[PDB]
Design a protein around this ligand. Structure first.
Ligand SMILES: *[C@@H]1O[C@H](CO)[C@@H](O[C@@H]2O[C@H](CO)[C@@H](O)[C@H](O)[C@H]2NC(C)=O)[C@H](O)[C@H]1NC(C)=O
Ligand SMILES: *[C@@H]1O[C@H](CO)[C@@H](O[C@@H]2O[C@H](CO)[C@@H](O)[C@H](O)[C@H]2NC(C)=O)[C@H](O)[C@H]1NC(C)=O
Ligand SMILES: *[C@@H]1O[C@H](CO)[C@@H](O[C@@H]2O[C@H](CO)[C@@H](O)[C@H](O)[C@H]2NC(C)=O)[C@H](O)[C@H]1NC(C)=O
Ligand SMILES: *[C@@H]1O[C@H](CO)[C@@H](O[C@@H]2O[C@H](CO)[C@@H](O)[C@H](O)[C@H]2NC(C)=O)[C@H](O)[C@H]1NC(C)=O
Ligand SMILES: *[C@@H]1O[C@H](CO)[C@@H](O[C@@H]2O[C@H](CO)[C@@H](O)[C@H](O)[C@H]2NC(C)=O)[C@H](O)[C@H]1NC(C)=O
Ligand SMILES: *[C@@H]1O[C@H](CO)[C@@H](O[C@@H]2O[C@H](CO)[C@@H](O)[C@H](O)[C@H]2NC(C)=O)[C@H](O)[C@H]1NC(C)=O
Lengths: 719, 72, 134, 67
């Protein structure tokens, strides 16, 4: 044999897959380097031949035994092909899941919002909303963009997300897994090696443990950013409270990288910029790659294949031929290796060239393994190798060694602190976001969170773990997490945590093996073939052996660790602890941006009515919001001599309790940034309280506003 | 009920003590803020006064909490 | 020829007559467009409650689904109801009569009205239990 | 209302429905929706327009703009 017949089929299947895969990759290569409807079908039919081949060969693998197989070499390949996949779902169910996924992708891609005052021009997220969330320094514009995108796209995406989770959970359960979260965590699972085992559940605990070592440094970063944001927006941020979610430099707060202009430790002097120096040297794509190849080969790694240098896409075609300039790496196979990315003259182009070259060198270092075994150890190694290569290639001594950055130049600590904080705002500002989003998805798939508490738990976790507070209260009509790319489009998100930890573990191990003496962030790798060899050891391993083993082959540790990352920022950590000596380090999960203009309401149905008292549902909340809108309309018409069309959508409610208690505030009809001050809302409630009371069969003691007390009771019975 | 937004009619003259303990366990800080009054019928019973006080301060006030009040 | 009284929506309309001076006499409030907003919200509440408590469906009717015509100083007008995001779906009168019957105690209390003052022509009040000497 | 991502303009989409659609529901949707969006946007501008045009016509030895 069974093991013999298994390897027999696998070897045949390897030949059958490699050739057709190459054709598909070549076809996709051509299309990606040639946007022609004609070649669109060409790659399609090839991809279709690749997909049908897939399904048939898995059906072939079905009869082959699994546990019976002892040779882990063959066992891994079979397990990879044994995946029945979504097919476990009923045909009608399979079609339903496919259309749900397509609908959610299309709603994310083509959804659009537009201005309340000029509804002719509407902005999509990709360009219009993203630009506002990055460049704008206006509180009102950012709040409008954040809330409007949430309203339109999340309210459209919620029910599809409910059906999606139900169907995906059903498929994962029918596929011999617990839940869909279990299916996602199954990537890390390793078994039957007797000493390097790794259970799917264990990963959760490990992740949690790692986050315990991040809380401190991150709280300091949060405190520093809060103080700076307080200056960028005075009278809007509480020094003891969380950060409003629409001020974090982009739509979601995945990265704080766009706060650097406002959080610069030393704005006096800029960071290293050699784009101009590169232009003065007139260095071109071929050079950047050649100098890159020098650095990569400078450590005993193979020289870049001549094939790439002949059939690559480094420069913008711009010859009636259009190709996506997005940096990528093609591993067509049988010695066919390519990289496609448009080459400008910039530092970021230089670093991206090094990143892509690290990608392709990792990919080509293990071409000897079978077709099913030609992949990274897991979903974090492949990007980690590129990240460490780019990080090592950006050292100031590297720029000193390539001919520019003349030796008569000393680098002070102030610019070093600037660079460290710029790196921190990208690396450390995303770990809480990643952890919290994956935690919420895991608990939603697990059934821990009921379907009527998704948004409650989302914002509770966001206030508690990330220290970010929503500017407007969101009920369960919303699907804010589904507004990310990775959530609507069915993508795993825990890769960005493990990748971030693996990159720093690898960097520390290699740079220690390079016999450094100074700090980690200033250290280099070049001329350290020992460091290169250690990296290559795991590189060539691919997915042939367990990822825990592969990680140990470089860092000497079976599992992931936060210590190396903490060391990479010990300098900034010390500076931040000094800068936050006066600032309250931490945050409180009770302050809200809208909490200072809210009114609390307490309702006692069982007292006023006793028996035959009605039940309180969402229709009574609809009536209450309409009554408050009526009250505000009447006040503005009969006193201020203005006619304003308040609705039940302008009355925002938060913190609903079984006591029939809750908070509310009011906004202008078509302006979420305009909040009516409490005093006006108190006056409006005073004017219309008799009508608001008699609408509900309550009389001024079973319906209390916590700040407004009756006073007009003058009796004149006995004269 | 106000201190812990408990559903009205859940806490009662009988389960008050247990609910008080549960609420303190849930939020000791918030419960610490809560102030309660000692409820002993003997206290109100011992409020019995002699002299005009018994009628003008005790009988006149009991009569106002009775239907057909003026008549009585 | 043609008649200028027929309307495509006039079959499923309900007429409403309101007498503020009879019910309240003195200290009776003025009737403006904000009272029309409250009335449309009350009818939307009524329709929501009927669909939730009988048909076991949750439908988000609003004040924009309650369409009002023929407003007179008598405080008379005609109304009908449509489905939330569908102007072609008109709830038949019978369902609107049943919804008003279910929520009429609440709709009247929201306007200090007493069924006599607030009249839905075609919907007759039938809750008058008389008993004194058992 | 079912799909808010595909939006029709009067000239290309709404005119074609009004010219060919025999569906009562599609035609009612197109008619009402165009009235709601565009007329509710165009009303106050029309009020200011009539006031200004009447003022200009009156200041030019004419009774009204209709004159
Ligand atoms: C599992 O099967 C693979 C494939 O047959 C074995 O890999 C072979 O290893 C021997 C010894 O190093 C080589 O001579 C062969 O050329 C390898 N074959 C291939 C296709 O790479 C592997 O050794 C087997 N593992 C065990 C434990 O038996
Ligand atoms: C996916 O389909 C394959 C093929 O029908 C299933 O393979 C069967 O697995 C069961 C359980 O191990 C065996 O008893 C059958 O003999 C297998 N059939 C074949 C043709 O080998 C596989 O189980 C399916 N996966 C899921 C989770 O539904
Ligand atoms: C790795 O070692 C090589 C060889 O010593 C370095 O190449 C030299 O670099 C210095 C500084 O730029 C030049 O002055 C020499 O002329 C170079 N000679 C040779 C033989 O290459 C290389 O710079 C080292 N790596 C780095 C990044 O400094
Ligand atoms: C770089 O090092 C210098 C020298 O230690 C630092 O200058 C000190 O700054 C603090 C804070 O203003 C003063 O209390 C010390 O007296 C300074 N020392 C000297 C010798 O001037 C400087 O702040 C450091 N820069 C960074 C980015 O940390
Ligand atoms: C929505 O309301 C907010 C709050 O009133 C408006 O923001 C104000 O805008 C005016 C005009 O630009 C400024 O003078 C104020 O200083 C702003 N203050 C605040 C609190 O934001 C906002 O402009 C309104 N938006 C629209 C479209 O009218
Ligand atoms: C909106 O409501 C109208 C009226 O009920 C619907 O039109 C009917 O739809 C049903 C179901 O497709 C058909 O059987 C009827 O023949 C249609 N004619 C009528 C009664 O007008 C319409 O389909 C609904 N559409 C939406 C968008 O909700």
């Amino acid at each position: 044999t069974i093991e013999e017949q298994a390897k027999t089929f696998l070897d045949k299947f390897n030949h059958e897959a490699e050739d057709l895969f190459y054709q598909s990759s070549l076809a996709s290569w051509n299309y990606n380097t040639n946007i022609t409807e004609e070649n669109v079908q060409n790659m399609n039919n090839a991809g279709d031949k690749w997909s049908a081949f897939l399904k048939e060969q898995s059906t072939l693998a079905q009869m082959y035994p699994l546990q019976e197989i002892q040779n882990l070499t063959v066992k891994l390949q079979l397990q990879a092909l044994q995946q029945n996949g979504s097919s476990v779902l009923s045909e009608d169910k399979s079609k339903r899941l496919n259309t749900i996924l397509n609908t959610m992708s299309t709603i994310y891609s083509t959804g659009k919002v537009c201005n309340p005052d000029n509804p002719q021009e509407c902005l999509l997220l990709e360009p219009g909303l993203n630009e506002i969330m990055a460049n704008s320094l206006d509180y009102n514009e950012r709040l409008w963009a954040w809330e409007s995108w949430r309203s339109e796209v999340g309210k459209q995406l919620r029910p599809l997300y409910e059906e999606y989770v139900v169907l995906k959970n059903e498929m994962a359960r029918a596929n011999h897994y617990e839940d869909y979260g279990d299916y996602w965590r199954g990537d890390y699972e390793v078994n039957g090696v007797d000493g390097y085992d790794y259970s799917r559940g264990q990963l959760i605990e490990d992740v949690e443990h790692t986050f315990e070592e991040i809380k401190p440094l991150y709280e300091h970063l949060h405190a520093y950013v809060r103080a700076k944001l307080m200056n960028a927006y005075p009278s809007y941020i509480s020094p003891i409270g969380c950060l409003p979610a629409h001020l974090l430099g982009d739509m979601w707060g995945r990265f704080w990288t766009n706060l650097y202009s406002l959080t610069v430790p030393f704005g006096q002097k800029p960071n290293i910029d050699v784009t101009d120096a590169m232009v003065d040297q007139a260095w071109d794509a071929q050079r950047i790659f050649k100098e890159a190849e020098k650095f990569f080969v400078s450590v005993g790694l193979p020289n870049m294949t001549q094939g790439f240098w002949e059939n690559s896409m480094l420069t913008d075609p711009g010859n009636v031929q259009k190709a996506v300039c997005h940096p990528t790496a093609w591993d067509l196979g049988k010695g066919d290796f390519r990289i496609l990315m448009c080459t400008k003259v910039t530092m970021d182009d230089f670093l991206t060239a090094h990143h892509e070259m690290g990608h392709i060198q990792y990919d080509m270092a293990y071409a000897a393994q079978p077709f099913l075994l030609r992949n990274g150890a897991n979903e974090g190694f492949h990007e980690a190798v590129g990240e460490i290569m780019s990080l090592s290639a950006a050292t100031p001594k590297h720029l000193k060694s390539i001919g520019l950055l003349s030796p008569d130049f000393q680098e002070d600590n102030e610019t070093e602190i600037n660079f460290l904080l710029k790196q921190a705002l990208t690396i450390v500002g995303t770990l809480p976001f990643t952890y919290m989003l994956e935690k919420w998805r895991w608990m939603v798939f697990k059934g821990e969170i009921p379907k009527d508490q998704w948004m409650k738990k989302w914002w509770e976790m966001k206030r508690e773990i990330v220290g970010v507070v929503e500017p407007v209260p969101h009920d369960e009509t919303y699907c804010d997490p589904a507004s990310l790319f990775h959530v609507s489009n069915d993508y795993s998100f825990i890769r960005y945590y493990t990748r971030t930890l693996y990159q720093f573990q690898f960097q520390e191990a290699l740079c220690q093996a390079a016999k450094h003496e100074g700090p980690l962030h200033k250290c280099d790798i070049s001329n350290s073939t020992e460091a290169g060899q250690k990296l290559f050891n795991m590189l060539r391993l691919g997915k042939s052996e367990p990822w825990t083993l592969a990680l140990e082959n470089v860092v000497g540790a079976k599992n992931m660790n936060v210590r190396p990352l903490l060391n990479y920022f010990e300098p900034l950590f010390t500076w931040l602890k000094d800068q936050n000596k006066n600032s309250f380090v931490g945050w409180s999960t009770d302050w809200s941006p809208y909490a200072d203009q809210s009114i609390k309401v307490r309702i006692s149905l069982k007292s006023a009515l006793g028996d035959k008292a009605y039940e309180w549902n969402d229709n009574e909340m609809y009536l209450f919001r309409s009554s408050v809108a009526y009250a505000m309309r009447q006040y503005f018409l009969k006193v201020k001599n203005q006619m304003i069309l308040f609705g039940e959508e302008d009355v925002r409610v938060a913190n609903l309790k079984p006591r029939i208690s809750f908070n509310f505030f009011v906004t202008a009809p078509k302006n979420v940034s305009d909040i009516i001050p409490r005093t006006e809302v108190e006056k409006a409630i005073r004017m219309s309280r008799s009508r608001i009371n008699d609408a509900f069969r309550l009389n001024d003691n079973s319906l209390e506003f916590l700040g407004i007390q009756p006073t007009l009771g003058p009796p004149n019975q006995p004269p | 009920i106000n201190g812990f937004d408990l559903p009205e009619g859940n806490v009662t003259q009988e389960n008050f003590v247990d609910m008080q303990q549960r609420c303190n366990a849930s939020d000791p800080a918030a419960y610490a803020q809560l102030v309660f009054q000692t409820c002993d019928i003997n206290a109100f019973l011992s409020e019995a006064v002699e002299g005009t006080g018994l009628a003008f301060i005790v009988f006149t006030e009991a009569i106002t909490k009775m239907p057909l009040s003026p008549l009585w």
